[PDB]
Amino acid sequence: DWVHTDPWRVLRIQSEFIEGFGTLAELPPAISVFGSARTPADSPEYDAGVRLGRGLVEAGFAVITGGGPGAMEAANKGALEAKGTSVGLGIELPFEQGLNPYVDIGLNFRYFFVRKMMFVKYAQGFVVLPGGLGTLDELFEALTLVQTQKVTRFPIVLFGSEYWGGLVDWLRGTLVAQGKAAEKDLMLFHVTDDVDEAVALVSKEAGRL
Amino acid sequence: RPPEEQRLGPVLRRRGQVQESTTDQRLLDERAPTDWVHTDPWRVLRIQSEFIEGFGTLAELPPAISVFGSARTPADSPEYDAGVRLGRGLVEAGFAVITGGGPGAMEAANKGALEAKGTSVGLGIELPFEQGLNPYVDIGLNFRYFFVRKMMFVKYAQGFVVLPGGLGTLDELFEALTLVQTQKVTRFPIVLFGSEYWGGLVDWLRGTLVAQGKAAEKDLMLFHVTDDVDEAVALVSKEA
Amino acid sequence: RPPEEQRLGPVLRRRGQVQESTTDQRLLDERAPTDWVHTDPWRVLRIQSEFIEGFGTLAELPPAISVFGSARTPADSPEYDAGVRLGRGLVEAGFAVITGGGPGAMEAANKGALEAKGTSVGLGIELPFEQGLNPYVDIGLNFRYFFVRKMMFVKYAQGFVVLPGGLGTLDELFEALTLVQTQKVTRFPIVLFGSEYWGGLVDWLRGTLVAQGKAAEKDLMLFHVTDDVDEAVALVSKEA
Amino acid sequence: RPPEEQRLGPVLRRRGQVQESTTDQRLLDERAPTDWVHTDPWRVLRIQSEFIEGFGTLAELPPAISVFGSARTPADSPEYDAGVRLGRGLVEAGFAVITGGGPGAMEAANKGALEAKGTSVGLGIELPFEQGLNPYVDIGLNFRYFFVRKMMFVKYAQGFVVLPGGLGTLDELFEALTLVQTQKVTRFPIVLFGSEYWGGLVDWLRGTLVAQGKAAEKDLMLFHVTDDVDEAVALVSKEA
Amino acid sequence: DWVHTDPWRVLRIQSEFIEGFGTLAELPPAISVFGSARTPADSPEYDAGVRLGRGLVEAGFAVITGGGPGAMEAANKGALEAKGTSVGLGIELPFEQGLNPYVDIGLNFRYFFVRKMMFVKYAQGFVVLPGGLGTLDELFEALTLVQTQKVTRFPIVLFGSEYWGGLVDWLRGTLVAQGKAAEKDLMLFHVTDDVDEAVALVSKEAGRL
């Protein structure tokens, strides 16, 4: 009754921001990592995320994920192995769930847009492992944030040139070519297959503001 | 004559604990350091205010569809004509039309919604260059927080129609998709307009994502691709 | 035994990120610097609290009229007798009586409202000298923010009756007038009592303001001047 | 191209008063000093959030009884068996069962409530050692503010049942008692289980407090002492 | 439904204060200017407001108006000519409206009492050009604020001795004479026909607290 009204909505929304600002205020410099929730632990892609997490911690960063399995877990796990600060920000879903075992500091948000915002405010760059719809979501959000000057010194690194190449050809081939985007917009992200270059690009471009 | 007892709301002050100045005078005279305006706790109050303002101005919106597409689309364009056609289509189906309030395809849809004498919404966003809401916007706001605006596009709509767009348009597209895929939202039709435009994207989604297990084939059923404005409108009214 | 995992609401802390003290202990032991109480962001929370307290205590007020007039009016006075008469008049017409809760004409009206066994409201304001709410106030608050109190006088009333007053009374008078002139408020009768008192003011409004184009002649119809308590009451019940 | 006019919500900026950065960029890039997280004004926002979270998660609770008792009660115990019996008893009477979510007697009652296929609530509290909610808790929260949790035990319940307990249990016991004695709460049955356990306390209340005028004899009627689970349940359903 | 309830009211009201405090926190010393919305641009009264705005800026002040036409516009316009900071605080009304073209920093308030309060908090004095009902409103509010010690060092200058003289005679002749006010209360304001004296009185009496 009262719980489906805008006055109650504002109070719940605002309390999630307070919970996010409070919990994340004193985080060190971070990078948000995204990727497939489905990636199996036996995989090379999984190993890359473990390697990526480890290398981001070595570069001074905390690592933030969605707290789920697959590539998220891999990156959190690597951040732990390296003795870094491992963060997970979950979204409450209809199914039963839980933050992955390698997350040290976590929150759950009910509101999709509050959580989204946390990923960008408390990080200074994004790394994107091969992933699904939710991964594409955050990828393109970051790209429009950078293109519209709502974040600065915000590197966006795509990992896996064969995985992402098809999308990249369509961005150039269709979007840029029809003037939906400019050719300078394609330089807002980088693509690589080497975990050390992913980290170096991010270290060079993020933060120090 | 300075009081021996003060009753200020729920507070009691007697004798030495009575104050020498009035509450109001401290409030209305005192300018102090203003560091606090540039801090996150104050920003949180600002963000909350913007949510409040949004819900207040969109309180009596009827059922709507949120339309997205390129800011750069020329007005002599077939894409642009499709956007007007669609704005009109949606009004006639009983929906309000919500857009980014920009130029191009956004303007096209708002224009169409006015031609059909419907309710035309433009939810703007602050940009680093000069750009006002488009001339066919009727209910207008300019948001300053991106993430506040994102939530208004979903909350007040029952589906998306996505004209051919840039990075901004894909950002919304994939947001609605994951919201529907994760079942945070339900009965939320998503329609893309322009099969030659969207076809290379859909081919990569199938040939790379689905093919490697990152999505399921049934996840590509969460949207429809069409070149027909009257089909797009029908799809949305059926499902919303 | 210090935890390896803490679940504190929506927050998860594991291993090194677990805290060494409890949330409560930091809250209940720690007194820190208290600069913040003297800052505007905190004042904003105080102001909001006072609004909340106001609406809470006036939640079940019936229809009311807000009465104003001099604080200094003597109790043996014909003005004072008129105020009692009017308080009574308004109760009998079905209204609650709202005043500043002061002495003089305010007290007169609250007194009258009690004689008629009605609801008698006194909305006080902090002053630099000792002065409590008057003895005929039944629902009483002492506000500390002027501008919070101003809004309560309009929100809970359907009209003003203005006995002969000082600066404070004119401040409210002209507030209601511009609110009605600008059509921010509607169906809001304003009645002045005392034609010999108010006549020099009305003459200047006509002979200077209206005559030079600052107001319209029809703007002087937004109030009525009377010497008859039973006319004043009738005017208000007709229009409110 | 940096704007000559900015419209950001209700705010207008022209010419020199236009800003050089966007609102969002200041929000999303800037990490500043973070003293504010350790201050009382921010704690107040945290406390409010926890209330909000509580009411949200307990929004559709049916009528409940709040059960208290020792954390240390062994599971092979007659006290423990009584707690299961009682949890079951209350469900069968139409009540939800609310507890501290701990072990011992709390766990006993939650267990019992599940056996009877009812709604089993565990309102936890942060402690300095590792301790999760008990395995028979169904609706679970872990509060970090003691005083927020205290109010949830009363607000969502219509009575207390108090199994033999320690300091924590007496704290709640005497809270409900004074709430009922002062008539801040009404129709709020309080039942103690275990006459050999509670008898020395009741003897002191009579032989010292009542006997010296600190309480009235009728104040000892605000609770009942029983050894019978089916009596305790009946008492509560009669009075709540 | 929910929008006409006190819980929603509190949230809207409070958000207007946040919007006002936020936008005006870093304003320089200011003076609020009031007057007829109807004053025509050809007028001497209009010229006086332009002259007044210019002279307040020269005296170190920002100039705040209601953002409307006539005397408001004149004063804002003068503040611009002088290169000062020109503020306009509007009230949303049933008609269509807009802040005057010479306003540099503006807000619109829905709540009358929030806006009123802004005029006094963010200024240190009032100047009152010949005006109507709304002008009398702010004039008398300031006078009771000063009389009841809710602002201090708050000059109140009335411009136009023939315009305001009638009111002044009635304040003395009727109010003071019947003890509704004291003779010291008449010294809370000043009346003048010279723009330099208006400014000098305000400069001497306002602020420095």
Added chain:
Amino acid sequence: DWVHTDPWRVLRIQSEFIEGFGTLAELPPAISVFGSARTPADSPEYDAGVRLGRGLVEAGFAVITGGGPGAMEAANKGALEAKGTSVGLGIELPFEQGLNPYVDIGLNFRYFFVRKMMFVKYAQGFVVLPGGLGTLDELFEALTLVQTQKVTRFPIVLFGSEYWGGLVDWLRGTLVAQGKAAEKDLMLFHVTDDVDEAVALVSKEAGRL
């Protein structure tokens, strides 16, 4: 209608915290005093509370009570006699009431749990004069706060060894003996009949954090 809903509840609750934090922020070190509201002024118990209040002020503390009569009034009265800061925090009840005449700084709370919290946050220890149900309430709340480490350096002194002895025997004899509490939990409080020892214990154990 709207006033019995959770959105309005949150706003009222929160405003009481703001009122409490605001009013009490700058309080000096304090001790909260509890006891019978029924204690008559002719009594030795009453004299003890006057003596207790006086001695707490001499020990540097402000004295906080519930603002009622009896032992509350006695302690407030003693704090005044000593020229200390005398605080009273009332709870609004169905009856007509008022803060005792010796309270210098007072608030009234509608919410029981907000007021309770104020007693502990703004004090550093509790003294408990012979009292009733409400006195036992605060006594046991403090004891579980200390036992669960939610306050530290928080002395709890019971005054009157014959009054409290019966309860103490039952805590030992029944609770401790059945393992509902440990024997170290009985050392969380002290019992005494001398007002100077009550004060000395409190002075030794409270605050300095």
